[PDB]
Amino acid sequence: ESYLWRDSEVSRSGSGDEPFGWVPEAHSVFTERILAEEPPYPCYFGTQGQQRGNNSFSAVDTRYPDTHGPAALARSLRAYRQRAWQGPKRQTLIVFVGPAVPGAELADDHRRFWTLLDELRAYDTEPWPADVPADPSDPRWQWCFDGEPWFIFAASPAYKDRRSRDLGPCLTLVFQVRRVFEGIGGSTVAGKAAKRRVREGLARYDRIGPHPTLGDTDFKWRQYTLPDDDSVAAPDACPV
Numbered sequence: 228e229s230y231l232w233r234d235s236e237v238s239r240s241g242s243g244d245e246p247f248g249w250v251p252e253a254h255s256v257f258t259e260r261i262l263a264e265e266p267p268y269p270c271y272f273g274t275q276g277q278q279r280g281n282n283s284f285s286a287v288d289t290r291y292p293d294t295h296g297p298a299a300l301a302r303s304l305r306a307y308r309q310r311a312w313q314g315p316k317r318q319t320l321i322v323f324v325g326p327a328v329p330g331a332e333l334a335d336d337h338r339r340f341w342t343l344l345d346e347l348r349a350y351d352t353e354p355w356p357a358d359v360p361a362d363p364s365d366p367r368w369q370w371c372f373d374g375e376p377w378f379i380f381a382a383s384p385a386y387k388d389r390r391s392r393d394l395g396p397c398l399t400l401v402f403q404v405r406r407v408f409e410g411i412g413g414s415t416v417a418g419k420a421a422k423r424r425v426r427e428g429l430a431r432y433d434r435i436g437p438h439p440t441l442g443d444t445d446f447k448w449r450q451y452t453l454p455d456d457d458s459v460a461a462p463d464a465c466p467v
């Protein structure tokens with residue numbers, strides 16, 4: 228009944244042409260990308276999280292939206308949020324949205340991403356947090372669920388130049404609670420070293436450099452769905 232999986236549980240998601248039958252292969256493709264030796268995956272935090280058993284997984288099967296869709300993902304997210312505050316600091320939930328769609332464009336996957344975030348709102352059982360403005364045009368808006376803001380981004384096979392965001396054949400949502408950044412705040416010595424290391428890795432991996440919206444940080448929504456080029460979306464244009 229729970230669709231929240233540790234690595235060792237993903238194989239039981241589905242087998243053959245069943246709901247989630249495509250999830251085990253997506254999980255393997257994801258881990259291959261994140262654990263690749265040369266060039267290394269640019270975000271060493273993600274690689275380390277995978278190596279240390281701190282990544283959890285879920286999925287949405289678009290063929291079965293009423294049973295394997297946003298309502299179930301809301302339950303999975305509530306369970307993940309509990310896990311994310313009890314376990315190690317640096318955990319990530321990776322959610323595969325499938326089956327894969329041959330020929331989808333990046334804008335299509337981004338539209339699906341924002342739609343899924345919108346559908347999740349109806350299933351949130353907690354009020355919106357008082358410290359985060361609820362208006363998505365506010366410079367300080369962040370996506371919130373189950374009582375707190377999250378960091379979230381969309382990965383897609385349609386990221387041809389920003390290869391670091393191609394995690395396999397499906398639209399893939401990467402969720403973290405903000406606890407993961409404790410110790411690497413942007414002002415911090417450690418945070419500046421972290422950005423150096425990741426951005427050096429990006430320059431060995433991607434066909435386009437770090438996006439300007441990553442910072443040099445209002446309007447975080449623009450980082451959720453980076454474009455594949457240097458375009459910069461209008462700040463008040465968040466689709467939610």
Ligand code: HEM
Nearest residue numbers: 270272273276317318319391392407408421422425426441
């Ligand atoms: C599977 C897990 C993860 C994946 C797939 C992942 C992916 C990425 C990617 C693609 C980037 C480049 C920028 C972007 O596209 O947004 C990035 C940057 C970064 N990530 Fe990760 N990440 C993961 C986990 C984590 C965790 C757990 C942390 C914190 C503990 C973290 C901290 C950072 C930092 C500090 C940057 C650099 C941001 C900058 O240079 O402005 N990541 N990550």
Ligand SMILES: NC(=[NH2+])NCCC[C@H](N)C(=O)O
Nearest residue numbers: 378380408413441444447450
């Ligand atoms: N684009 C990224 N993956 N950024 C990772 C760090 C996010 C940063 N701590 C923030 O809250 O904005």
